[PDB]
Structures are given as C-alpha cells and as structure tokens.
C-alpha cells in the first residue's frame, strides 16, 4: 500500500466533499463558526488534534447524515465512509491501532430536533461538516499523530 498515493487520494476526496457541500446553495450562506443552540451535539469546530478524534467525528457525522432523507447526503455519507477507511489504512501504515468508532450512543435526542426543525439541522450539520473537513485537511500535512 503506497502511503503517498493514499494521502493524495484522501486530499482529493476531502476537496470533493467540500465542493459537494458548496453545490448546496442554502448551506453556503450560513456561517460555519456561528453557534446555534440545540445543535451542540453535532461535532463542530473544536480542535481535532488526533486521528482517533477524527475517526469518531466522522463516525458521528455519518450517523447523523444517515437519518436525514436527502439524495446528496447519502453520497456524502458514502464518501465519509471511504474517508474513514483511508484514515484507518493510514493509521495502519503508521503502526497505529484505530478501534472502529461507533456513532453517538445519544441519538435518542436528535429525533426531536429533526422533527421540530429540519432546515436548521440540515444547514448546521452540512456547514459544520465542511468546516471540520477543512481543518482536517489543513492538519493532514502537520504529521498527525495517534
């Protein structure tokens, strides 16, 4: 397994997902950093220093995206799955043992927000996903560690 090729593919996949979110017009106008109450459970911009943190973050995002009926979101979820697999193979090439992250145990609350306000949940989840991917891409050259 070529490490460099996997890293470059990971970069391309990240940009691809970012562009996908860019296509979604309503998400672009919404501030990524801005805090909205109730969405706090979504892993937004809070320093993601390590590979295990990245894995659990992506796992939670996949779990949240799976519940929302949208054609674009399913593809994004698949890309996130591929991204996780790429991170796992990289963690193997670095001699790290990444345990397979379960999603959030605490989804019993997410149903309420999805029912009351779908629009807020979708725009926030997408914008925070884009932000999280951007810092991950920034840090991927800094020699991330486990």
């Amino acid at each position: 397994v070529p490490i460099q090729k996997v890293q470059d593919d990971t970069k391309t996949l990240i940009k691809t997902i970012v562009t996908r979110i860019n296509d979604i017009s309503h998400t672009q106008s919404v501030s990524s950093k801005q805090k909205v109450t109730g969405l706090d459970f979504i892993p937004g911009l809070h320093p993601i220093l390590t590979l295990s943190k990245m894995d659990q973050t992506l796992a939670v995002y996949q779990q949240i995206l799976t519940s929302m009926p949208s054609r674009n979101v399913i593809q994004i979820s698949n890309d996130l799955e591929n991204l996780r697999d790429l991170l796992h193979v990289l963690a193997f090439s670095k001699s790290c043992h990444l345990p397979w992250a379960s999603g959030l145990e605490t989804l019993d609350s997410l149903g309420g927000v999805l029912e009351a306000s779908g629009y807020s949940t979708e725009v926030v989840a997408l914008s925070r996903l884009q932000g999280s991917l951007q810092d991950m891409l920034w840090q991927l050259d800094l020699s991330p560690g486990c």
Binding site: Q34, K35, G38, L39, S120
Partner: peptide, 15 residues
Amino acid sequence: DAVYCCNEHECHHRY
C-alpha cells in the same frame, strides 16, 4: 424563508 429571533449572537433552532 426561516426568520430566527435570537438572544444576541447566539441563536435558537426554531424559526
């Protein structure tokens, strides 16, 4: 259009 009313910078989910 979803119009939100908020306490200062921090906003709520409902609209």
